[PDB]
Amino acid sequence: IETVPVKLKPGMDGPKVKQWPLTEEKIKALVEICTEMEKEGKISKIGPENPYNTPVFAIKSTKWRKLVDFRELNKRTQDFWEVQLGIPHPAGLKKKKSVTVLDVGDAYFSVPLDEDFRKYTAFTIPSINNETPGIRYQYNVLPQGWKGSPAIFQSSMTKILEPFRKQNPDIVIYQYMDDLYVGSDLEIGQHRTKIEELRQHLLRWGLWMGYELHPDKWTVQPIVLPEKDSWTVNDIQKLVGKLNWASQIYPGIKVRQLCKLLRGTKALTEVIPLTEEAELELAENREILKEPVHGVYYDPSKDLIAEIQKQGQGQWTYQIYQEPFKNLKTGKYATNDVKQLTEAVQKITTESIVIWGKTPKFKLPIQKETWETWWTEYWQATWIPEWEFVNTPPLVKLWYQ
């Protein structure tokens, strides 16, 4: 087994991302891992003639796991892992009754990395109070978290899977990052039985959410128009605002029959009766918002982006789109703000993977530093989606319940 040559391009140099401070328990957790991995020859120490860095973290059960943040490296390797050596996305995956995710990250350790490419995998284990310069490393085998790894490894992956595919051709399998997404329409017992079978196959070679995903029972969260016994002026105003902003997404939303109600200068508290055409306009808008958005389609060349709103009482709402407010999907999520926020990210990112074969750039409603301090404390994923930090317009929070 010899190595696939890799590259960035003539343009773009490698990643020089700073290492975010880690607590003592993790720094220690990371040295145990990095000692074992150096003895096993997977990684090896490095001198400062390597100017590149990628952040590393420790996550989880009782056992720790090393997570390496290859977000910059992926961005700078896109030609390699997407166009040159890509993995196609099956549109059937989302159609399946059940999808089970399996971690096939160990696979990548038994495959050497292009010696010319190893300098771009440098990371630092930092030292408390900057006591020591802190332990520098780089990878010799394929690293987990880098998108090139499955890109390279797919030829060997096909072999491993061939018998299983042949024997179960209505089971669809997708490889993303360190994970196999394996979906079937079998009954839950038979499905699980089939997953255990796939485990054995893998075994012979080297190897939110809630157990298994169930894609076909994923549905849009409609913009909810209340039914209400009695309607006040305020309530109509609120209803008009939703419908005025929904019309910027949904072909056919109408608000005219409701303006008819709000006359000239009424008190907000004043009740007002429910007119016929307003009654119809209301119900006809309702039916529109059940359905997906007419006119909006996934363009694989554009980035997916996700916005999430904190709805209070452990409620979160979210929307995925490529062009602002033109939603490919909207949804919902339901013990502390950051913990939940991180669960929602992971969830939404999973859906994004099952549906379009990539993760969205998140617009997270939280102060940069709070998130950077705490996201890892509850993070369970093998990947890390791209995020920026945004103040939620208080109106948008309102419009999605």
We find the least distance from the C-beta atom of residue 134 to another protein, in angstroms, to be 7
Please tell me the distance from the alpha carbon of residue 215 to that of residue 363, in angstroms, as a whole number: 24
Answer for the pair 384, 71: CB distance below 8 angstroms, yes or no: yes
List phi, psi (to 5°) of 67.
-115, 125
Of the pair 90, 241, the CB lying nearest another protein is at 241
Residue 373 binds to another protein (criterion: CB under 8 A): yes
Residue 49 binds to another protein (criterion: CB under 8 A): yes
Q: What DSSP string runs through 206-269?
A: T----SSB-GGG-----------SS-BHHHHHHHHHHHHHHTTTSTT---HHHHTTS-SS--TT
We find the least distance from the C-beta atom of residue 300 to another protein, in angstroms, to be 31
Residue 374 binds to another protein (criterion: CB under 8 A): yes
Of the pair 192, 238, the CB lying nearest another protein is at 238
Cα-atom radius of gyration of the chain, to the nearest Å?
25
State which of residues 3, 78, 156, 244 lies at the interface with another protein (CB under 8 A).
244
Answer for the pair 52, 17: CB distance below 8 angstroms, yes or no: no
How many CA atoms lie within 13 Å of 143's alpha carbon, on the beta-carbon side? 30
Q: What DSSP string runs through 21-88?
A: P--HHHHHHHHHHHHHHHHTTSEEE--TT---B--EEEE---S-EEEE--HHHHHTTHIIIIIIT--P
We find the least distance from the C-beta atom of residue 382 to another protein, in angstroms, to be 24
Residues 141-180 that bind another protein (CB under 8 A): none
Residue 393 binds to another protein (criterion: CB under 8 A): yes
Of the pair 161, 243, the CB lying nearest another protein is at 243
Residue 366 binds to another protein (criterion: CB under 8 A): yes
> Which string of x and - marks every residue 182-221 that binds another protein (by CB under 8 A)?
----------------------------------------
**Axis crossing angle, helix 188-203 with helix 148-167, rounded to the nearest 10:** 120
Q: Is the dihedral angle over the CA atoms 381, 386, 390, 392 positive or is it negative?
A: negative
179 is in an annotated binding site: yes
Residues 321-360 that bind another protein (CB under 8 A): 336-338, 340-341
Please tell me the distance from the alpha carbon of residue 257 to that of residue 240, in angstroms, as a whole number: 10
State which of residues 41, 86, 92, 133 lies at the interface with another protein (CB under 8 A).
133
State which of residues 65, 97, 136, 358 lies at the interface with another protein (CB under 8 A).
136
Residue 392 binds to another protein (criterion: CB under 8 A): yes
> Which residue type, as a one-letter code, is found at position 333?
Y
We find the least distance from the C-beta atom of residue 19 to another protein, in angstroms, to be 6
Residue 128 binds to another protein (criterion: CB under 8 A): yes
Of the pair 103, 372, the CB lying nearest another protein is at 372
We find the least distance from the C-beta atom of residue 261 to another protein, in angstroms, to be 8
Window contacting another protein (CB under 8 A); options: 165-173, 233-241, 292-300, 317-325: 233-241
Residue 230 binds to another protein (criterion: CB under 8 A): no
Residue 254 binds to another protein (criterion: CB under 8 A): no
Break positions in the chain: residue before each gap, C to N over 2.5 angstroms = 60, 207, 334
Please tell me the distance from the alpha carbon of residue 293 to that of residue 320, in angstroms, as a whole number: 12
Residues binding another protein: number (CB under 8 A)? 69
What's the chain's length in residues?
401
In the complex, which residues of this chain contact another protein (CB under 8 A)? Answer: 16, 18-19, 21-24, 27, 47-53, 122, 124, 126, 128-134, 136, 232-234, 237-238, 240-241, 244-245, 255, 259, 261-269, 309-310, 312-313, 336-338, 340-341, 364-367, 369-370, 373-374, 391-395, 397
Binding residues for Mg(2+): 103, 178-179
